[PDB]
């Protein structure tokens, strides 16, 4: 019949597909490329801009900007391209003809919501729209009604406690460490081994290193001394030209910054201590049900070792008699979109959508009243 679109604007990926699907139909980096060089040939192709995997095809010739930084849309005319590319090229489907669901971080400036709504009706004339908190959808994907969601994406890390389907909006934590700023630290220490990675297209080369080779120390001083003691950790990577580069203690040292934001020069404590300090804000009766239901979410939690580090370190904060449990399906990178696909299909949800007529009557303020 007619099936809602589900679209999730990360900082580092777009995931999109139809509701009811098992997995997203199109994924590509939320990146816009422009040429930065003199055109030599007439009869060369002309395009003003390359979006996503096109821009990743030709990155050597391009300047690459992300429109989203710390989950905030920083300029609109690029993002409106990324959505144009998504609906017309990737999904090959008219946005005029399907409900659409759009996915955002829990605290970011509320103009971001206003404009994100405004474009869907005013530019695309989508029939119906909603906006949903990522940490909620992580529970729908996990198949739970009660839990604390730890979420870390490309651009934002946040916690939300949810107990029996009630959120605790006083209890919510946000951190602006994320996979991007791990990558920016990874460049700066990679320099110490005498490899130098300067430019915007070259940063993605670093990002591939971070994805392939990093892992999280279980005991940081022992693994540091072990790497100092021997090559046994040391592992090496090819480069697109065929150079090989070889990396030692460093390959774990970046994931450690999520637990010690002192390295990057943040004030706030690691994701473990902020998770605990989120739990403390909940009523004591709740807390046993959160301590079991820790849910990992988002791609930055994909590193091997992070579940064991989380359990081992939050265990040392909690009262000993509790059980700590950590729930990390390998789906989890997808899970925010899977959850949104689950939500968008429910019949109860159909009774709430921002509808075109209601938007026209209310104006773009309507989101703040209706949506949350």
């Amino acid at each position: 019949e007619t099936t809602a679109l589900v679209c999730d604007n990360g900082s580092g990926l777009v995931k999109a597909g139809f509701a009811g699907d098992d997995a997203p139909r199109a994924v590509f980096p939320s990146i816009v490329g422009r040429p930065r060089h003199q055109g030599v040939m007439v009869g060369m192709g002309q395009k003003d801009s390359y979006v996503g995997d096109e821009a990743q095809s030709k990155r050597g010739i391009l300047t690459l900007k992300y429109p989203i930084e710390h989950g905030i849309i920083t300029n609109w005319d690029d993002m409106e391209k990324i959505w144009h590319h998504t609906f017309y090229n990737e999904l090959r489907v008219a946005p005029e003809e399907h409900p659409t669901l759009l996915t955002e971080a829990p605290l970011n400036p509320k103009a971001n919501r206003e404009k994100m709504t405004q474009i869907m009706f005013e530019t695309f004339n989508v029939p119906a729209m909603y906006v949903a908190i990522q940490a909620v959808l992580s529970l729908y994907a996990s198949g739970r009604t009660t839990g604390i969601v730890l979420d870390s994406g490309d651009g934002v890390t946040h916690n939300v406690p949810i107990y029996e389907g009630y959120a605790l909006p006083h209890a919510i934590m946000r951190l602006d460490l994320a996979g991007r700023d791990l990558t920016d630290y990874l460049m700066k220490i990679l320099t110490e081994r005498g490899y130098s990675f300067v430019t915007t297209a070259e940063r993605e080369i670093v990002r591939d290193i971070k994805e392939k080779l990093c892992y999280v120390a279980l005991d940081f001083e022992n693994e540091m001394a072990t790497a100092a003691s021997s090559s046994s950790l040391e592992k090496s990577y090819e480069l697109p030209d065929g150079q090989v580069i070889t990396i030692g203690n460093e390959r774990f040292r970046c994931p450690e910054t999520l637990f010690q934001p002192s390295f990057i020069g943040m004030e706030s404590a690691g994701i473990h201590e902020t998770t605990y300090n989120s739990i403390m804000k909940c009523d004591i009766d709740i807390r046993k049900d959160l301590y079991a239901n820790n849910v990992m979410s988002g791609g930055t939690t994909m590193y091997p070792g992070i579940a064991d580090r989380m359990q081992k370190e939050i265990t040392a904060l909690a009262p000993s008699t509790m059980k700590i449990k950590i729930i990390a399906p390998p789906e989890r990178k997808y899970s925010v979109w899977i959850g949104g696909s689950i939500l968008a299909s429910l019949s109860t949800f159909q009774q709430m959508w921002i509808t075109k007529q209601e938007y026209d009557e209310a104006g773009p303020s309507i989101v703040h009243r209706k949506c949350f």
Binding site: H70, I72, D176
Partner: peptide, 7 residues
């Protein structure tokens, strides 16, 4: 953002 951070 608009203040405490670059976005």
């Amino acid at each position: 953002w608009x203040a405490x951070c670059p976005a």
